[PDB]
Design a protein around this ligand. Structure first.
Ligand SMILES: [Mg+2]
Ligand SMILES: [Mg+2]
Ligand SMILES: [Mg+2]
Ligand SMILES: [Mg+2]
Ligand SMILES: [Mg+2]
Ligand SMILES: [Mg+2]
Ligand SMILES: [Mg+2]
Ligand SMILES: [Mg+2]
Lengths: 326, 326, 326, 326
C-alpha cells in the first residue's frame, strides 16, 4: 500500500536543473550528483553563488537554467516563490513543449497561488527531516520518509516520474514513500504550527504566572522545573523510538496515574480547538489572512515579537541563562 | 540570593548511611565515596544486595544502618516509603538523641504522611536531573541544580547541614542551589504531570482523529507528521540552550506568524485549567485520591492502560514501527 | 457464527475440582457426575460440608482440592472471592505447571482484581438462568444459553477447553453458546442493575405519590392497580415466548395507541441516562466506588435500606398483604 | 521627575534641515531661526515652495536637504510619510555615517512601518497644541508641553539631543517636558479618537432621536439645547483652568446631584468599552485595518460620510444655521 522501491530509468541522460541553493537545495543536489545525473545549479547572484561553484557545480541564472533543463526542482522558500515565478519561470514555460515541474512544499499550488499551464507535469516530493540531519545520514546508507503527490496529469508517466526522484535523492530504498495529495500535504504541515505547538508554549507560560504570582514560588526555581532543565528533550527522544504510550513505564507510578486520568478528562476541550483550526485552513481563509499581512507591511507580526520577548517569563530566563553559562 | 558554594566541615568524620540502592542511591553514594566520607549501604535483601557489595561497599539491614549512622538519606521510592518507615526506621529514631533525616522528594512530608519526632532535623536535597545523566557528567567536573528546604528546625545548624550535602554529592560548585520549601517542591513536581503533559498528549491524539476521520488522510501519513518523526525532539533541544522564544528564528516566517498569533488567542482557555489543577493539589485532595486508589486495588489504573494501548492511534503506530526497523 | 456442539474428549480421565458448594456449585457438579467425570468438592467446613457428603461426593479442603485437580471451577460468590483466592489458591498455582482456571462471573478478572499467572489458562462459562430452573430442566433433556470467553492464552487448546465444559455441564446440545469476552460479560450484567431496573421501581414509586397526594385516590386502591395484582408477571411471560412488540396485539386498541406514541416521545430522555451509566462502568469507576463502601463498613447501604422499607408506599403495602392472605 | 530646562550647546554650528513646510513645519522653523541656527527648508515643488521663499529661507529638494544636514526633522503628515521616506530619504541615510532623525508623531515607528538603520539616532519631540495657538504664544514669552522619547540609542548623546530641541523650538523654559516612549505616544493619541470622542457625538445624536420621535419636541428646539448654543464651549473653558470637578460649583444644586449620581452609575458600562479599544490598538490590529482601507480605495470611508451628512439631525441643523446668520 506504500512504496518501497522504484527505478531510475525514466530520468537518465537528461538535464536536472535545481533552482535555489539554500538549505534544501544543497542536500538534494549532492546526493543526485553521486547517483550520476546531469545536475546544474540555477541561483540568484548572491553569496551562495561562490559557495556552489567551489563545491563542484556549474552555476547559471534562473531563467537560463530552465531553458537547458527538462526536469526542474523549485527548492526556494515559499515567501519569495510567487514573485520570482511570474517574473522568471512563467515566460519560459510557454516556450517549452513538455516539462516536469517539482515542488518541495504544497502551499502555493494547493491554494492556487501558482497555476502552471496544461502542457506541464506538476509533482511533489516532500522530505520529513530538516536537512542538517540528512547529510549526516547519507554516509550511513539509510533513508528517510517522503510524501508523493501529482496535481496535473499530462504524460501518463506522471506517477512514475515521482517515484524515481524519491529513489534519486536517497530516500528509498531503506525508507517509506507514502502516496498523498497536494492538499493533504499543506493541511498536515499547518496543523502542527496552529494546534499543538501554541497550546504547548501557552501552557508553560501559564504555569509560570500561576506559580509565581499566586503561590510565592521563586522566579529562579519555577524555571528549572518547567523548561530550563532538559527533561522535555529527554522524554521526547523516547517517543521517536519506543512509542508514545510505551515510554510511560520508565516513570513513577504516581506519574502515570496523573497523566492518564487527566488526558481523558481534557480530551474534548482540546478537541474543539482542533476542529476549528482545521476548518479555517481547508476553506482557504488562513491563506488570505497571511497574504494581507505581507501587504500591510507586517504591523501585527512586529507588535507580537515585542510583547513576547519583553515579558515576565522571558526577562527572568535571560538572567538564569546568564548564570549557568549558556 | 541563590547559593554558589558551601563547606564540607560539619559532616566530616561521621557516618553517612544511605538507605536503598536504587537509581538515585547508586549515583549519590558514588560521588560521596570519592569525596572521602564514611558511606554505608542499607539495603533490603534483594538483587541489589550483591550488586552493591561488588561495587566496593558494606551492605547491611535497614534498621541496623540507622543505628550506626548519624546522617541518613532516604533514597527509596515514594510508593513504598510509608510502610517501610513505620516498621523499620520509626522504632529506632526514638532510641537516638540527635539525627538528620534527609529526603530526595517532598511528597510524604508536605502532606503529613510521614511525621518524624521533634528531636530530629528534617532537610531536603532534590536534584533536577535523571541519574543516568549525572554519572555521565561526573567525569567532566561540572554540576547540576538542586533545591534545598528545611521542615523542622532543631539544632540551629539545620540550614548549614543542607548546604554541605549539596556540595558533598557533586552539585555545587559549578551549579545552582535554590532555597525552597517542602510544599513548593511537591507543588511544582505534580504540576508538570497534571497540566502540560496530558494537554500535549491529548492534542496529538486529537489531531490524529480529525485528520484521518474527517479529511481522509492516510493512517500511515498522519503519524509521520505529528510524532513518529523526531522533530519534537529536535526543537526541544534548542529550548534548553537558547530559550523558548529565541529558538523560533530558525523556522519559516509562515511558522512564526501561526505560532505567535494562536499562542495569545488560546491563552486564557488553558489558563483556566492550570488554576483548577493547582487548587486541587494545594488543599491535599489529590493525595487523598491516590491513597484510596492503592487501597481499592487499582481498578481505574488497570482500565485506563487497556483503553490507551488498544486504541486507533496506538494500533497503527505498532505497524509503522514494524516497518522502519524499530 | 454461534456454537451448537462440541466434544468431551479434551477433559476425559482427568480430575475436575469444584470449589464451593453453593447454589451454582450444586447444579453444575450434579450434571457432570452423570456425564462420567472425576468430580471432587472443595468446600469450607460449613453447613454445606455434610450436605455435599450425603449427596454422594468426596469433600476436602480448598487448597487441597487444587493440588489434586487439573481443571478447577470457582463457583463462589464475588464478594468473598478476592480474599479467599490470595490466601488459599494463590500459593498453590505457582507450585503447578499447567492449569485451567474457570470462572462463572466476569467481574473480578475484567477489572484486574484477581490476576492469575502466565502459566495458567483462564476461561469463562456463564449461564443465563437461575439454578433453581436448571435442575428442573435436566429431567427434560433440554439446554440453556451460555457465554464463553478466554482471557489469557497459554496452550492453544484454550478455546477448545471452553467449548467442552459448555457441553459437559448440560448447556449444549439443545441450546446456544455465544462467543463473548470478560469485559462484555461484566458490562451487560451491571447494565441491568443500573439502567432499567431502578427506573422501573422509581416510576411505580412515583405513580403512587402523584395519585394519592394530588388526586385523592385511596391508599388501598392505588396499590391494586400498579403492582399488587399479578399483571406485571403476566405480560412478562409473553415477552419470553412471543416477542416484545408482538405481545401487544392481545391488548385493547386504546392501550396500543398510548404505549406506542409515548415510547417514541420519552426515548431520548431515557437514552441520556444509559449513555452515562455505561461510561461509569467501562472506565472502572463503579468498581472503585463499591470497593470503598465495603471498607468504610457500609454506612450508605445501611441508611438506604432504612429509608426504603419505612416509606409511605411500603407501610401501606404491609397492611394490604395482611388482608389478602400473603 | 520631569524636565524644566536644557542646553542648546550640542546643536550649535551645525545644519538643521526641516522637511516639509506644512502647518507644523512653519511654526517650528520660525522659532529656531530666531534662536540662531542653520535652518534650511526641504520642500516639494508645491504652493508652499514660493511661500517659504518669501518668508526668508532657502528652499531645496527633499533628498538634497538631507545630504547637507546633520539633524533632520520630519514634519510631514503620516498618510504620505511612508512612501516618500523609502523613495527619497532611505537611499541617502546609508551614505551617511551619523545622523539624528526626529519625528513629531509616534505612529509609523511604533508599529514598525518605518525602520531606520542602526547607524542613526531616532528621537521624538511631540507638542500638545495646535500650531495656530503656538505662534500666538511666541510673542508673549511662554511655552507649551512636549513629550520626549528615544527609540534607537547609538552615540550615548541621544537623550541630551532630545532635550535641546525641546528648548530650541520654544517649549522649555516655561513649560513641561515629560519623558515618554514611542509606544505610549501612539496609544494616548488614538485613545482620544476612539473612546471618548465617538461616545460624545453618538450621545448627542441619540438625544435628538429620542426627544423628537418619542416626546414630540420640535426639531428646531431640540437643537438649541444640546449643541447649537455655545454652552459646551463655555463649560469646557473652565476645565482647562480650574479643574474637572471644581468647575461644577458654578452650576445649580439640582445640576450637581444629577451629574454626580449618574457618573458613578454608568462608570462600569463605559469602562468595558475603553478596555476593548485599548487592546485593539496595542496589539497592532488597528494599524492593519487602516492600512488595508487605503489599499482597497476607501469604500467604507466614502459610505460613512454619506450616511452622516444626510441624516435627520444634520438636515435640520442646516436650516437653523440658515436662520441665525452663520
Ligand atoms: Mg511539521
Ligand atoms: Mg514548514
Ligand atoms: Mg518535572
Ligand atoms: Mg517525580
Ligand atoms: Mg441480568
Ligand atoms: Mg449477578
Ligand atoms: Mg489628542
Ligand atoms: Mg493626531
Amino acid at each position: 500500500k506504500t512504496v518501497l522501491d522504484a527505478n531510475l530509468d525514466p530520468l537518465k541522460g537528461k538535464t536536472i536543473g535545481v533552482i535555489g541553493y539554500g538549505n534544501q537545495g544543497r542536500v538534494q543536489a549532492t546526493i543526485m550528483r553521486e547517483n550520476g545525473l546531469n545536475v546544474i545549479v540555477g541561483n540568484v547572484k548572491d553569496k551562495y553563488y561562490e559557495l556552489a561553484k567551489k563545491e563542484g557545480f556549474e552555476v547559471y541564472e534562473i531563467d537560463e537554467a530552465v531553458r537547458r533543463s527538462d526536469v526542474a526542482l523549485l527548492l526556494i522558500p515559499d515567501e519569495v516563490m510567487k514573485e520570482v515565478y511570474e517574473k522568471k519561470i512563467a515566460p519560459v514555460l510557454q516556450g517549452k513543449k513538455e516539462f516536469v515541474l517539482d515542488f518541495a512544499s504544497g502551499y502555493n499550488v494547493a491554494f492556487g497561488l501558482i497555476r502552471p499551464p496544461k502542457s506541464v507535469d506538476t509533482i511533489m516530493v516532500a522530505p520529513r527531516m530538516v536537512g542538517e540531519g540528512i547529510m549526516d545520514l547519507h554516509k550511513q546508507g539509510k533513508g528517510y520518509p517522503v510524501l508523493l503527490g501529482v496535481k496535473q496529469d499530462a504524460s501518463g508517466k506522471a506517477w512514475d516520474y515521482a517515484k524515481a526522484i524519491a529513489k534519486g535523492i536517497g530516500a528509498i530504498p531503506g525508507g517509506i514513500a507514502v502516496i498523498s495529495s497536494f492538499e493533504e500535504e499543506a493541511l498536515l504541515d499547518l496543523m502542527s504550527e496552529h494546534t499543538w505547538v501554541p497550546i504547548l508554549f501557552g501552557a508553560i507560560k501559564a504555569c509560570y504566572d500561576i506559580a509565581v504570582k499566586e503561590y510565592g514560588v521563586s522566579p529562579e526555581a519555577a524555571l528549572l522545573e518547567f523548561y530550563a532543565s532538559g527533561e522535555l528533550a529527554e522524554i521526547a527522544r523516547l517517543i521517536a523510538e519506543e512509542g508514545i504510550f510505551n515510554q510511560m513505564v520508565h516513570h513513577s507510578t504516581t506519574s502515570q496515574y496523573g497523566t492518564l486520568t487527566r488526558m481523558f478528562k481534557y480530551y474534548d476541550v482540546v478537541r474543539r480547538i482542533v476542529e476549528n483550526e482545521a476548518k479555517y485552513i481547508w476553506d482557504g481563509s488562513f491563506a488570505k489572512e497571511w497574504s494581507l499581512e505581507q501587504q500591510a507591511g507586517y504591523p501585527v507580526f512586529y507588535r507580537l515579537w515585542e510583547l513576547a520577548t519583553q515579558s515576565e517569563m522571558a526577562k527572568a530566563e535571560k538572567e538564569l541563562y546568564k548564570l549557568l553559562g549558556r
